Design a binder for these strands. Sequence first.
DNA 1: CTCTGAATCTCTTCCCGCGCGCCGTAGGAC
DNA 2: GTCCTATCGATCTTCGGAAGAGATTCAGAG
Lengths: 201, 32, 309, 99, 50, 98
Amino acid sequence: MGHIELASPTAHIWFLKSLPSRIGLLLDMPLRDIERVLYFESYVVIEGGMTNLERQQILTEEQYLDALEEFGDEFDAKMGAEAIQALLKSMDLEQECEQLREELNETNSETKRKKLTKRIKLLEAFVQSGNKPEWMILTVLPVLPPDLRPLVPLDGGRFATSDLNDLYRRVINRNNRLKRLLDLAAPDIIVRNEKRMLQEA
Amino acid sequence: GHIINKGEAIGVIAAQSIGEPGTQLTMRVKNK
Amino acid sequence: SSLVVLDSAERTAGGKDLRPALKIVDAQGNDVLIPGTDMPAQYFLPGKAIVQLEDGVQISSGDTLARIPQTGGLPRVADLFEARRPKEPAILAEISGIVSFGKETKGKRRLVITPVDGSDPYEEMIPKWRQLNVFEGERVERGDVISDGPEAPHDILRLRGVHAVTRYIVNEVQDVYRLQGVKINDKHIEVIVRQMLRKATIVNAGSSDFLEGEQVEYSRVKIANRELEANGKVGATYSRDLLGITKASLATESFISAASFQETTRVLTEAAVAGKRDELRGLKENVIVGRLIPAGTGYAYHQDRMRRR
Amino acid sequence: HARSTGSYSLVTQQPLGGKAQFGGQRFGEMEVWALEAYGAAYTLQEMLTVKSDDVNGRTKMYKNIVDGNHQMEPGMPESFNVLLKEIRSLGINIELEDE
Amino acid sequence: ETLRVDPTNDRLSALVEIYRMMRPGEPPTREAAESLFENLFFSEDRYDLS
Amino acid sequence: KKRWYVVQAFSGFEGRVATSLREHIKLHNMEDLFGEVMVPTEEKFFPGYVLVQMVMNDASWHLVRSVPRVMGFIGGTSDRPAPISDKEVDAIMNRLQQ
DNA sequence: CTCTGAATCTCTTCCCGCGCGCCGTAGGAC
DNA sequence: GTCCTATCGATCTTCGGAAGAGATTCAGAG
């Protein structure tokens, strides 16, 4: 195999949109709202410190432009997959489980005791494996060994349209642009364009 | 006709035994 | 005329909570008893009822006080094994003793069961338009039928047990083949049921290390129990629970065989965050990796390999 | 139509299918349940590896048959290694394990 | 009964609801909304019972 | 005061988008609502984006999105799309000057 | 004020083989 | 005519699937 180094973190679609979301469930954050971060529709707030803001709590760009001057930087909020990666990295995972397995008893409410039983299972599964939550987010993307996706010629000098090689081609083009526009230091709106187009590729 | 042999794959025999006639269905006082 | 008794849908709590009644009466204030009975001969009227027997009529034993006027081929087996609940699930009673009303029909009716001893306050929301086989005074059991309509295996398992659900499923599937003249030995259906109810749901974790409630493969809890019982510590208790095959396969304990069936991106990610591990017991996994199946001739080899051990 | 040996596909080494190509008949899914329903395990092992997919074993088999030795070395099919890499081409580390 | 479901007040609030139900993420706008609504039913480029 | 905005075009038809944009300005004669139109070029960043000195009315927004072969603005939202920054405009003009 | 009921949305599944037949990146710029 | 780069960043993907199940959204109220 080989790999691609992505110019940013990137969420793996599977864990974003399985039965529940493994991302969202682990975070206690609704699927639509992490997608609202990951396709760059809103910020998400982290390490909120001495300001009136919560632990995840997506805030619109209006509502960030608020906080940018109602507060200084005694908090943070980010956008795109880096922000989710930070949130997952923030997981004091066992301590959250030890709490939640007690907060289980804090009501007899069937309508969450069970989807909480799910969440307290999940946390303990991430604990008992060797796994760590940030790995839901890609950073090196492996590429399939080439013989499994051969570009065979057909009737005369034409290659068979060999689908994956059109998909990796999309990725790598976008990544080439994103490395460029990062190092040439583009403004937020431009990089949020290419970063959206890369995640969407 | 004798008792089953240890090791026989009875599960797969049963699922097939239900399915084989599955084409033959349709999808649409008397005496003292 | 015979009078129409009002429906709870045609009249208010000032008619609903006034639930109509036909107690048989004497100036003694109570009827001549059945030996060992305290109950007077109080009787009652449901909705829609037709009543000819107004006040001051002398009633005989056996007189009607009143009267109340009132599937497929293959799918009816496919939806049997998948254990889908029917459209019209007969309400089956639970625990024991005697019914009562709870509170009357608005939004829906609510009705009750109260035992000979123990937990009296069991109550249930009940549909109005399924006419009731009992009213207020009727001796009842877990599994007595409170409406008509077809049953639902989830509840049969809860109320008459695994043996009773086998007997149900074998009958109600063979009634399709016998109708169309096909013959199948009954054991080949039990072998599917055997698989449908391989999972169990923990009620007491006891001293065992399962979660305080958990769903587990039944063999796994049973093998933990047998040794813990030999240790004399409190074993776990559970209900077996009946999954339909389209789900009881995805719940196999071994991701390759499930993932190669259907819903692949579910199974192959749910298993991946769990970091799950597969021992390749069973057939379909050994076919995938192309080795002797542990069946038939290949079972006898896996057995000799496992015996010289 | 009949085939002793001839072409194999590139992505996974199973035989081609056709008369317009000198193809091998599909021992498809239902046939495998049919073998499993006899006790027949060695037949199946062969049919889906030595006769089919195992890039070593089929050339060792062929030579053992011309030698008339009537014995096989079964290995592990290369289409299954294709699967592993196609999963490992997702960020999913699947791997073979030893004990 | 339908007027008991109805969230609209009058024409414009309905055109708002139309444009937001049909093209979510585009802005409703008085001059812009009709360039949806008329091309749904009343313009030859996009509606035609032969 | 006219602030800057970013327009996305079909990448490759960018000069024709810029010409059609200037012509739509001089057709619908909102001449006091547009300053310039930048496509910077090195001996070509940015690959498919058109810079427009503009103000924000909904009429001028419909004007720029009614210019052909233009997808839309790129900002935080589509209600009130986003200008970029003072120092970012100054640095783009710096490298365009250099 | 949100707790168990129910309500609208999406996702996922749909026989096995087999044989033919054809058809198979575009648009723009230099 | 050949070589290189990109897709409606100024529309409109089809209504004639059912189902069947789940995730996710809302009632009448204690």
